[PDB]
């Protein structure tokens, strides 16, 4: 947990919680 | 959770990349 990998985590479900919720979005609606 | 990180970044990693890789093409004109 340690700010070691606590701190990039952060980076990775960021953007993919954004993504995650848009693609069906993306592929079902165009 | 230091153990947890080690899993929660494979965890990420593995779902970040899949989407990253899908909405890249999904979201082209969009």
Do not use: F, I, W
């Not at chain 1, 701190?7 to 993919?16: D, F, G, W």
């Not at chain 1, 919720?21 to 993306?26: D, F, T, Y």
């Not at chain 2, 947890?4 to 969009?30: D, P």
């Amino acid at each position: 947990e340690v700010q070691a990998l606590k701190k990039r985590v952060q980076a990775l479900k960021a953007r993919n919680y954004a993504l995650k919720q848009k693609v069906q979005a993306l592929r079902h609606k165009g | 959770e230091v153990a947890q990180l080690e899993k929660e970044v494979a965890q990420l990693e593995a779902e970040n990349y899949q989407l990253e890789q899908e909405v890249a093409q999904l979201e082209h004109e969009g």
